[PDB]
Amino acid sequence: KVFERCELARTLKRLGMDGYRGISLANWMCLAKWESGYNTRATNYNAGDRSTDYGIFQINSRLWCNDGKTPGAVNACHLSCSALLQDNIADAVACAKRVVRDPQGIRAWVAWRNRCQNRDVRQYVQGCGV
C-alpha cells in the first residue's frame, strides 16, 4: 500500500522507531521516502549480484531476508522476503531495527547517505503531530 506521509510517521512512532539506536523519526522517514516513496509493494532486482530489495525500506535479500533465489543469502532477519511486501509494516520495522544494530547503522542504506545525511530532514515529520 502507499502510505501518506503523516500516516506513516505515526505508524513508525507506534512501532518504536523514534530514537531507536539514536535515529530520529525524520531520518527513517527520509529513508522510506527515497527508498520506495512510502510504498510497501516496491521491489528492485539487482541484476549484477542477483539480489532483490523488498518493501518500504528496500531491504536486500542477500543479507537480511530470504527469498530462496539469491546466491550466498544470510537471512539475518530470519524473515521471508514476502513478509516485507505486506501492508502491515511491523515485520519490515523489526528487520529495519536489526539492520541498524550493526555498527554502520542507517548508513547501511546508501540512499540515506546520498539524500538525507547532513541535510535538514525535519520537513518529513512536520505537521504530523509526532
Side-chain angles (χ1 to χ4, degrees):
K1 75 138 152 179
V2 183
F3 278 74
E4 299 195 273
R5 187 178 58 99
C6 286
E7 180 193 16
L8 179 61
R10 292 187 298 266
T11 305
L12 289 180
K13 143 254 174 294
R14 266 194 269 106
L15 294 172
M17 294 289 256
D18 195 18
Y20 183 85
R21 286 311 111 103
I23 300 163
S24 65
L25 267 200
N27 275 300
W28 293 111
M29 287 294 283
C30 186
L31 178 70
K33 206 277 177 198
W34 293 110
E35 289 298 341
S36 66
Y38 314 132
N39 176 15
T40 65
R41 304 157 288 180
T43 48
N44 153 155
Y45 172 66
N46 304 296
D49 75 338
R50 299 174 189 239
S51 65
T52 301
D53 304 310
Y54 295 94
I56 198 160
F57 293 126
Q58 294 290 279
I59 289 175
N60 191 271
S61 53
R62 192 169 319 289
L63 289 304
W64 302 111
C65 69
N66 182 36
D67 67 5
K69 61 181 188 186
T70 306
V74 185
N75 192 14
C77 293
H78 302 106
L79 259 194
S80 164
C81 286
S82 58
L84 310 187
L85 301 174
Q86 297 177 95
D87 287 351
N88 160 38
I89 62 161
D91 284 321
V93 166
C95 186
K97 289 171 175 182
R98 171 60 190 88
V99 176
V100 306
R101 288 190 208 121
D102 269 20
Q104 320 71 256
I106 193 162
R107 252 156 276 231
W109 286 275
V110 43
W112 182 80
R113 298 181 202 172
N114 304 343
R115 244 115 178 172
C116 309
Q117 177 165 208
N118 303 326
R119 290 177 195 233
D120 178 20
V121 292
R122 244 49 46 185
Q123 65 291 126
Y124 295 102
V125 294
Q126 164 234 266
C128 304
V130 101

